[PDB]
Amino acid sequence: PDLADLFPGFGSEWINTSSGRIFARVGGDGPPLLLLHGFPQTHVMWHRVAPKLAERFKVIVADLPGYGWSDMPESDEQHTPYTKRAMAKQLIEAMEQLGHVHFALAGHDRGARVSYRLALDSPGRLSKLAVLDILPTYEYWQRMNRAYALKIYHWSFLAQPAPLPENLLGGDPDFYVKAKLASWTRAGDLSAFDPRAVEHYRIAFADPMRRHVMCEDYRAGAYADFEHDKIDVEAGNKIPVPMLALWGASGIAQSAATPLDVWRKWASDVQGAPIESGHFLPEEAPDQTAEALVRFFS
Amino acid sequence: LADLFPGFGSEWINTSSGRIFARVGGDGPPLLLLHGFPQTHVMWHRVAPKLAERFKVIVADLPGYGWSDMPESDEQHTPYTKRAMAKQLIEAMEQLGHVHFALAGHDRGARVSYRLALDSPGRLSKLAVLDILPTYEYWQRMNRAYALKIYHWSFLAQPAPLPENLLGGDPDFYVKAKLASWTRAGDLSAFDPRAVEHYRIAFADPMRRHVMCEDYRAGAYADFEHDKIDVEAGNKIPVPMLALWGASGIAQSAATPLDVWRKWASDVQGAPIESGHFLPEEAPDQTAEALVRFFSA
């Protein structure tokens, strides 16, 4: 049961960075567009939307640092390489390796957190930003309440000090990754996913080192990411890059607050739309997602 | 498993919702002691014997815990709501002829205790709660820091079988992690190793683990709704109560415990004890002294 290739025609690049290789599928031509997945997935989550994107753009579908087939930089007490700030710097360096110093960027889930952090830290690097089904990390933590704590319990679970989440994830990793996939879809099962993509996610999640990375990501998400965001809210720093906020009508970011209102606080130029899906917009509603992206990225 | 209450009898008390296991010793006015998670009645083994010099001490496994039976849960986790547990323990005490008793609870047991106190205050002479605030207050104070600190409130309340499946890979690790994590030392040195063994063995049973999750699911849903109604109705515990908390325990991380408890209780005395969460094991003498003095007053 090999993984196999969900991006016919796309090349496969290993992009060197100072913190380790980024893996990417690259296809298409035209302006560069970087696509960033999140948790618990890999780049293959774009497999239904990348083709439609690659009709107009040089689509780079990257595994986040530490995820998928990207190298896992050694973490540290502060989870530094898995802070969205560090990850954005690494991806910037990755894109520089391909000669893209100014590119479009669409991120889903953790990848979206990299992406808006990228926009805050290095807005000159982006022509346009799209974030899929997230609010800024600071917003999740500020709105933390009973309802949210139960809904995004993994934000605090996975952010527990090692080795607690790692050992518990170890208890049934196949179950957990499928549970997370299914439970944030509209259908509530795995039917929205290509089973070959589910297999990519399952294989990456089978790896304890990959799971530790994801924990590091969430640890960063509870601490440094939050602190970094807090500096920006308190400074009134806004994302100046034109952005599109997509969210699933039945997803994660929609009922922490109305996501366009929240993002309007963070970005001076945002448009947004609900998409009839759960969290996994590019796979639950690929046509609608792809069409929204292509229209906004043009 | 070791007998940590030499001289205490044992009772299996039938109730409508299953048998309640208790160790019973001493003589005098009836004092029911309720443990919490991930413990069993044996957490009281260092203070019960001092209590048993002055009271008839009944050291009960909560419903579904320890050796108490595990009523089947349901969609609303009814049997593991503190309201149901309270009713079941009332029925258990009635089986012993104690319709009016003193009650001290720790952790989940303290939640049963203040719920009992709210639902059926006429059952209680006095109430002591150890290292908790009301469930409602934890959830109301559920911000970033606190969500990280008591992440298990929301992890264990996830729909079955998620926590159950994760817990089942290495049960020993998790019960040990939680015991150690909530002590002032961050290790297991407070505990009697024989008591840890009781805790670990109870936790090794997947049904027991499920029960614990059900308890926490109740704690996230029904229990909170029940507390919510009371606090928004201004219902207060009318029974003299003692709030004890660990200076390094859980309840203090959420708020000033005495202030919170004075919102819930018309007659509350409070004292911190230099201890982590596990007052009767980390600080047995202080805890036993505090309880003896409060209950014998």
UniProtKB/Swiss-Prot annotation, chain A:
Any coiled-coil regions, as ranges: none
The EC number(s) this enzyme carries: 3.8.1.3
Top-level EC class: hydrolase
Effect of residue 184 to F: Reduced catalytic rate. Minor effect on substrate affinity
Sites marked Important for enzyme activity: 133
Keywords: Hydrolase
Keyword Hydrolase: yes
GO molecular function annotations of the record: haloacetate dehalogenase activity
Catalytic activity field: a haloacetate + H2O = a halide anion + glycolate + H(+); fluoroacetate + H2O = fluoride + glycolate + H(+); chloroacetate + H2O = glycolate + chloride + H(+)
Domain AB hydrolase-1: residue ranges: 31-269
Record Gene3D superfamilies: alpha/beta hydrolase (3.40.50.1820)
Residues reported to bind fluoroacetate: 110, 113, 154-155, 218
Active site: 109, 279
Xref: InterPro entries: AB_hydrolase_1, AB_hydrolase_fold, Epox_hydrolase-like
Signal peptide stretch: none
A Pfam family matched in the record: Abhydrolase_1
Family: Belongs to the AB hydrolase superfamily. Epoxide hydrolase family.
Subunit structure: Homodimer.
Main function: Catalyzes the hydrolytic defluorination of fluoroacetate to produce glycolate. Has lower activity towards chloroacetate and bromoacetate.
Protein name: Fluoroacetate dehalogenase
Taxonomic source organism: Rhodopseudomonas palustris (strain ATCC BAA-98 / CGA009)
Lineage of origin: Bacteria, Pseudomonadati, Pseudomonadota, Alphaproteobacteria, Hyphomicrobiales
From Swiss-Prot, chain B:
Residues that bind fluoroacetate: 108, 111, 152-153, 216
Catalysed reactions listed for this entry: a haloacetate + H2O = a halide anion + glycolate + H(+); fluoroacetate + H2O = fluoride + glycolate + H(+); chloroacetate + H2O = glycolate + chloride + H(+)
A Pfam family reported for this protein in Swiss-Prot or TrEMBL: Abhydrolase_1
Parts of the chain that traverse the membrane: none
Enzyme nomenclature, EC number: 3.8.1.3
Residues flagged as site, Important for enzyme activity: 131
Keyword hit for Hydrolase: yes
GO molecular function, one term: haloacetate dehalogenase activity
Listed PANTHER family: EPOXIDE HYDROLASE
Subunit annotation: Homodimer.
Record's protein name: Fluoroacetate dehalogenase
Species, as recorded: Rhodopseudomonas palustris (strain ATCC BAA-98 / CGA009)
